[PDB]
Amino acid sequence: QNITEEFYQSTCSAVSKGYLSALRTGWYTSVITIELSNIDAKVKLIKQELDKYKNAVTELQLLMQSTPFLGFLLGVGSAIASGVAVCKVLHLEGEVNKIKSALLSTNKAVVSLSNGVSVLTFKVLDLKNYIDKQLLPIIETVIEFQQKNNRLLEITREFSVNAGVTTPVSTYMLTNSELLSLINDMPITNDQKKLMSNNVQIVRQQSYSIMCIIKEEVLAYVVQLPLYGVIDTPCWKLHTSPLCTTNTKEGSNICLTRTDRGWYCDNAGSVSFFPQAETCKVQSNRVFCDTMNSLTLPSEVNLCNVDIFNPKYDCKIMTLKTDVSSSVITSLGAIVSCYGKTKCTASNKNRGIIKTFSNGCDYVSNKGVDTVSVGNTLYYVNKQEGKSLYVKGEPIINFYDPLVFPSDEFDASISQVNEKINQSLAFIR
Amino acid sequence: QNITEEFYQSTCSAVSKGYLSALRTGWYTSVITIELSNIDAKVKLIKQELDKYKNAVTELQLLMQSTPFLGFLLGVGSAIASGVAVCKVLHLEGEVNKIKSALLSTNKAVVSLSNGVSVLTFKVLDLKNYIDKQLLPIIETVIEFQQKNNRLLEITREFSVNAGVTTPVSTYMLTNSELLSLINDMPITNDQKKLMSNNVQIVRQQSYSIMCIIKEEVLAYVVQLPLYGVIDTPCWKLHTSPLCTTNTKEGSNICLTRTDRGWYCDNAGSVSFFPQAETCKVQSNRVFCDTMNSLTLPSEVNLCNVDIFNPKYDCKIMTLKTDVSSSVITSLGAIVSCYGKTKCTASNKNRGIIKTFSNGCDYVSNKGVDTVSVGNTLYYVNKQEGKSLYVKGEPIINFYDPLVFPSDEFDASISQVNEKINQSLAFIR
Amino acid sequence: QNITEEFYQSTCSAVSKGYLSALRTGWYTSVITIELSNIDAKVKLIKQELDKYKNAVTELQLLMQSTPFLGFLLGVGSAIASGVAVCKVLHLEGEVNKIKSALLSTNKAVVSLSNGVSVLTFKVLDLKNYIDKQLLPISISNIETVIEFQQKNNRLLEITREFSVNAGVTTPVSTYMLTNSELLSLINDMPITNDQKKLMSNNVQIVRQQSYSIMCIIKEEVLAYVVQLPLYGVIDTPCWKLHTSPLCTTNTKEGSNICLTRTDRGWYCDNAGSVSFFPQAETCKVQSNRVFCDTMNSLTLPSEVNLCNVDIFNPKYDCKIMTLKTDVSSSVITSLGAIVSCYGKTKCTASNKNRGIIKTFSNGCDYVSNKGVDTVSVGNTLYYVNKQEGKSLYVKGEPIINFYDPLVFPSDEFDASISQVNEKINQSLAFIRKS
Ligand SMILES: *[C@@H]1O[C@H](CO)[C@@H](O)[C@H](O)[C@H]1NC(C)=O
Ligand SMILES: *[C@@H]1O[C@H](CO)[C@@H](O)[C@H](O)[C@H]1NC(C)=O
């Protein structure tokens, strides 16, 4: 919609802002059911296709016994725990029969379970009605039985190669018409209904299908859908690249890299920080993330982009000497960390080189630039529309005396480096 | 069984014990074969479906030319080497003919290869017999040929998008009736037969299907199954979380995290340590692991849970400054590392917040607890039955003088930190 | 060719040389199109099979709205950025019509887009021609009309299913997205050199794995997706694989021991006067003696980095090392043997199938060739060695860790080098020496 991006020459980092949040805060668990039947050449094909039915039920029975930079700081939880709790209820006596009763006259029904969870239950395939009413005979019957048995066969195979938990949720587990109607009857706000409906493919990837139970001639599996409790708050993506001195002797050079790269989103007076930005999915200017992949930081962490030396937040950096050249493709441009004898250029679609990077950390916007070359690596830039702003600044690495600079600090900060410099300075005195 | 769990307040860690081992120590390689045939509307549908057959054989021929926290300490090996060694033998002249001979009158046959490996060979589809007997014509025949060609096409498609090696092994590569009979005829003990048969889904997940050879009208691929040479020894899971001081100035705070978290299992007088606990699969109270993902440690490593300062094992720790809050969901509870201004609570579904964590490292059991909230993240606890024991203790981080404490140590130990403190204390004097 | 391997006892590392390069340096974007149609008991099967057609089109419209050791030193890029840029062009007005017009008389056609990118457009399935000619029934003469519609609709349903469970980006590219006959002709009509044509054709399975299929657009009754194929700008240059393992002292007190590991392990290939270094060797795929890598997973280093295997103390390149104390035993299975780092009380052996244990590794770092060796055991872990034919050379040498004073040796250095360790030792030695 309106994406902007600022590059900070002083800290060799860039922030892409203008995005809107869609953060997964809750789960909606629904129970999907398939009603099963206990049981010339046109008849031989029927028994062969019926053996597929009996082998799929055996697999599901034999599968039901299988009960369901700063990223290392993250917590540890189970993503499907709320879906497992619903599945544990279905194993209670008379609970599957409660679902079987509510879907007797209709396909969509809201069922309140014995543990108080009111789930929205679906009957998506009626194979007991088909197989039992067409059990009288034992080519038109052969083809239509393969079409109705196909969904059961594919649901079973997806569960077989995924321990009974699949993500993203396929059209076999839940069709678009079923998912769209499930969203409409879902007890959520109108903003969440419009968001999930306009992005059903993202909803599928952040959803789970959990194989549950097959008893009393009923196959039931749990589809666990994301609930976005945070919508339309500001998000911004922080890109970082190593910032080194560019002296002629490489042994006297020191480096510094901001380690707080990832996705940031405003959330409930704090900031939700996703250190491994691969765990978020971007749709135009909407970013979908799971709060399980996040750290909760003070909102003052944003100040590191403006003044990395601010007294309100201890900005995190590393000081590993990384004297090799690399590039980071941002949202609207490219950061280039060019060091040593590496050839660092930016080229245009048809004409070739239009910018030659010198040693140090620099930036080029994607306007009129299509590729970036660093050594023998060719990078294509993102061609999304948006404005880039180059914030000139003295590289902060030039403020440090190399003789007392603490190199090889893995997870440090501005204050930690300041503290270690004083100790070394004390030894000098 | 009876899962118990101890939380150690002194080192911010918890051990879940009561599990039984099932460690992959060996491989069983079997050769799966499909006998192939060399080569109006009822005739046009056949020839287009015959083009699918010729395109799958071409694909498999074109695929046969494709010859088959502490986790960074692990070794490097090839998981499929034992299956590849069998596949290299099948390319010798007359070796495929021996298998074709032993499967001439039956589907199950044990063949001793030219390298001395007595493999259990299967003929799972006799497609040469079908195409040759129904080669006379050149609608009932069209449908039965789609059913007869379906398994060959799906085996080819799984190999095409997996470089000829698939895991888990699908029901197309090996059906349940074939897998169960393969287990029964497998030269193993009755205890291992019952374990694999009661856990076929885990066996599939820890198995490989290796595309091998397609010559002399025979398609042959190797299914490599796990052998659990370590069964029913004690296992326990170690959870760790950062332990920091809680002084009023955040710059004067120091942290410490046990780095030895993961799965531990007794094995042959030593302990098999799996540093990335994601590489193990837990079924009720049995834990399935592959010894390739393990380090072999002295059994005295258990002493770190009772006395982290013991003289018999140098317990491993890190000292990265962790000013962030997080939680670890254990087997019977939750560890909460709460620092700064973060809201850290444990709530009940209907009763609300029942524990408010203060700054530091603490623990809550799952008894009466449903969720744990740390900042903007909600964690669900396991509702598994079991007793938790809270071992009160002074957090060991309080024993260290912050002025000589070595922060930012990535892979340290109790002795290494003591050594750097002595050196720094020596420099001062 | 001839795979050889040298083990350097001094640095606990081994180099496997004799490989030939096939490096992904660029991307080629092609546009694959499917022409679509805007629309008794045997009549129920057709419309039920026709509901699958409209449900696949609904998915694709609803999917088109979703527009897409030293490895931490690597850069960060978008792998499909070049294909997304081509797809962004197809969303322009009248751009699909240029493709729709150019594919009117043929299936293979080169189309010049409005921004000058000359893409190679392909039409692989004509479903508008079939549905329009068989639109008369909408009552059906025979069942054969149902079966041929299941056969003609099968590829569209499977392309949609692969896109549905992959956000519209699939890799490797399946035979549904592009068949072998289509890929081989796409390779032949691809404007590349004859060496690159022969390389891709004899290795189509690798080409599929290093390719992307990007769902793009559904407009004007045309389904179009972009298949992004690898361009191998570096072929047949020498490559070599470097294996490393921890090198520690074996003193009687386990607390007085220090360790050192070469961190520059990975794949190396000569490339344009420099060396392309792939620190995570899992990102390369080896076919016999040819190695396929992506330059996006590489660093461009001076060629003097090779000197670290012969003289780790050379003045021309600062060889990279770590000094984390790794008091555990481990093994690395190389191309023609095995490196074993054995420490403490661990049992470390190499055995034969029939002859038994033939080498027992002692504390420290050692190496055994695959000649007569079938397995390597370290503790409770069994590793199988490569049975490939080739010569191993054991380069005797004093382990360099014995050259360091343990009392001033800087342990727990995550990403250091020979000079960085020397500089930290001097500072500690200077403080001691001034006293
Ligand atoms: C340590 O150095 C930093 C550098 O800015 C300074 O702010 C701080 O006061 C110093 N502290 C001591 C004890 O020298
Ligand atoms: C090293 O530290 C330990 C524990 O702090 C202490 O027992 C020992 O005496 C120290 N060594 C020296 C030489 O001071």
Ligand SMILES: *[C@@H]1O[C@H](CO)[C@@H](O)[C@H](O)[C@H]1NC(C)=O
């Ligand atoms: C640093 O150590 C090297 C030997 O490793 C020596 O040649 C050099 O003079 C030292 N520099 C000092 C002590 O300043």
